[PDB]
Amino acid sequence: NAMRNRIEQALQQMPASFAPYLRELVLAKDFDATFSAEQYQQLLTLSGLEDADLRVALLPIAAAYSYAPISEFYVGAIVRGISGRLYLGANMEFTGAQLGQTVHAEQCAISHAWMKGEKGVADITINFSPCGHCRQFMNELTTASSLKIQLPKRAAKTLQEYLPESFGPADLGIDSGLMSPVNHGKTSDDDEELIQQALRAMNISHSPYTQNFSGVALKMRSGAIYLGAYAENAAFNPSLPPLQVALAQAMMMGESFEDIEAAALVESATGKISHLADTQATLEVINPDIPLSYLSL
Amino acid sequence: NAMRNRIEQALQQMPASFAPYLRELVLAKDFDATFSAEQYQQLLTLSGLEDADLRVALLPIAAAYSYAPISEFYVGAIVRGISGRLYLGANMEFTGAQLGQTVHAEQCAISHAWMKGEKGVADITINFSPCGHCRQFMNELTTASSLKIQLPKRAAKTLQEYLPESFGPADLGIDSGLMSPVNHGKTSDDDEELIQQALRAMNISHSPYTQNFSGVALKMRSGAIYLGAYAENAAFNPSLPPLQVALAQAMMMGESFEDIEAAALVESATGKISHLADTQATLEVINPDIPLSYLSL
Numbered sequence A, B: 001n002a003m004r005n006r007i008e009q010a011l012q013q014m015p016a017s018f019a020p021y022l023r024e025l026v027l028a029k030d031f032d033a034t035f036s037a038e039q040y041q042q043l044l045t046l047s048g049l050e051d052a053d054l055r056v057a058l059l060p061i062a063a064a065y066s067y068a069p070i071s072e073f074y075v076g077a078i079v080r081g082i083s084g085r086l087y088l089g090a091n092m093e094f095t096g097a098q099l100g101q102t103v104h105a106e107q108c109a110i111s112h113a114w115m116k117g118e119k120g121v122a123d124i125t126i127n128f129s130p131c132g133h134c135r136q137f138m139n140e141l142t143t144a145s146s147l148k149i150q151l152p153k154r155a156a157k158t159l160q161e162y163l164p165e166s167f168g169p170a171d172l173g174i175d176s177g178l179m180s181p182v183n184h185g186k187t188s189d190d191d192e193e194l195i196q197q198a199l200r201a202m203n204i205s206h207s208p209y210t211q212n213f214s215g216v217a218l219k220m221r222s223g224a225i226y227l228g229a230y231a232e233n234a235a236f237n238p239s240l241p242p243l244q245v246a247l248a249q250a251m252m253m254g255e256s257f258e259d260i261e262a263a264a265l266v267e268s269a270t271g272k273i274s275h276l277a278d279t280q281a282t283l284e285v286i287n288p289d290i291p292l293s294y295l296s297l
């Protein structure tokens, strides 16, 4: 885990009541930046705190994963999936790339729950009040109208309270299904294993506005492979490209971007857009030696 | 053309009270998608309507400028600068490019007001509720706290009502100054005139988070020149790149992007990001024959 040093700082400030148990979990080799419902129950019992208070108290663990070399402003978010599992996320910024390549903690935590199989978000606890871009991103979700947003000691609020008279999928005559299960059924006989992995990500992607179903697969020095599916948004700009999603999974799993050895991008030949130019440009600012395999299908 | 036809369609739907004078202004060979305070007052007197209802009535003139090859969803906006002059705007989409390149109507109308000299927005009128991305963009303005947002038959609202507990420049320790008077005073003895024009835009650009003061100049086959200055945002993703701004100015003057002959991008050597990759990639989906001159200053 490349972030353990910063995680240790966050742990050093955690209340004595639950720090030992949290430490045992977060410093474990395979810590995946998630907490099961059972582990959460144990944190509650041990902390003696009310639910909202405990989630807020855990935020620094999420913020410890922040990669913000442009702003040096560290944002952490905690998403409780509808299953009850908690998923951590942090913001990511890319020096030398246009700001549309930025990933917000909220987007990171939500993509983390989604790539791990959640069908929706129950609530999200955030370091700072969510910006309009994140509010709008959240409105694409299956649980847009039911999820709760929690800031420190403040009352929890629904998305609608943070984004009154919202614009969303409905306005483009489409249902709000980000996180709903899908299989686009795309198939390829390509012999490259990294392409086939990206294709699995493409097959669960959400792109009802451009039909550019797409995915990215990142192979690491360790041999691990991280997938990222495209999460498009009705307002267009809040869309989260597949690379950003893959990078987020790698980061939350404790990987260093300096350890990426290869990337693969797979997209739709009939998509109204392409992520190729931006995937290449962003990989170049990360490491110009990373080769990118590509397939339009 | 499609644009001329939509304008004609919009005109035919205007009440006879002011349609004849509106026609006269909108069909002028020099119409620049703006209405002077005087022209607007006269239209108001001819119409016998209340101020807010006339602005709403004029919305289809702005929407007629929409360039939406992806969604075919035409959004129009009318920004009233603090001078009293009205500036039209519409959404802009680019086939083959990542969605961060999209421009919302609200962004277009505001950048139009900004590029023509306005130091603040008094009010913005629109057909639909602004999405979160636009709300976040407006929160960067010098008049974020005083502007009004007008929708059809609804009372005017403040940005705070649409964006409660907002995130913005203050959270990053900075004043909200987009549209305030700016002169970075940068110079260059570069003998290329198009670079000199792009530098004029760069010298008024807004980039307090990355310091990538930047500008673009577009030259049409006719010889008309359009300038665009970078309008960065504290939420990062809602930042409006300089190409986008210049294309907005071209579009509101009635130009066709097929008629762009050359482009120039000027940015800062100490910027934490670069617009090069995305400027070349977007111009490429517009017309691969358009050359891009570049200077990192």
Ligand SMILES: O=c1ccn([C@@H]2O[C@H](CO)[C@@H](O)[C@H]2O)c(=O)[nH]1
Residues within 6 Å of the ligand: A068, A071, A073, A075, A090, A091, A092, A093, A102, A103, A104, A105, A106, A128, A129, A130, A131, A134, B167, B234, B235, B236
């Ligand atoms: O709600 C927000 C607002 C901002 N940020 C991050 O804060 C920095 C400045 O906006 C960027 O890295 C951005 O992604 C978030 O993660 N979430």
Ligand SMILES: O=c1ccn([C@@H]2O[C@H](CO)[C@@H](O)[C@H]2O)c(=O)[nH]1
Residues within 6 Å of the ligand: A167, A234, A235, A236, B068, B071, B073, B075, B090, B091, B092, B093, B102, B103, B104, B105, B106, B128, B129, B130, B131, B134
């Ligand atoms: O408030 C909004 C929401 C959406 N759009 C435009 O509508 C299309 C679909 O979101 C895109 O071109 C987008 O820029 C706007 O102009 N303003």
Ligand SMILES: [Mg+2]
Residues within 6 Å of the ligand: B142, B176
């Ligand atoms: Mg002020």
Ligand SMILES: [Zn+2]
Residues within 6 Å of the ligand: A104, A106, A130, A131, A132, A133, A134, A135, B235
């Ligand atoms: Zn945000």
Ligand SMILES: [Zn+2]
Residues within 6 Å of the ligand: A235, B104, B106, B130, B131, B132, B133, B134, B135
């Ligand atoms: Zn918008």
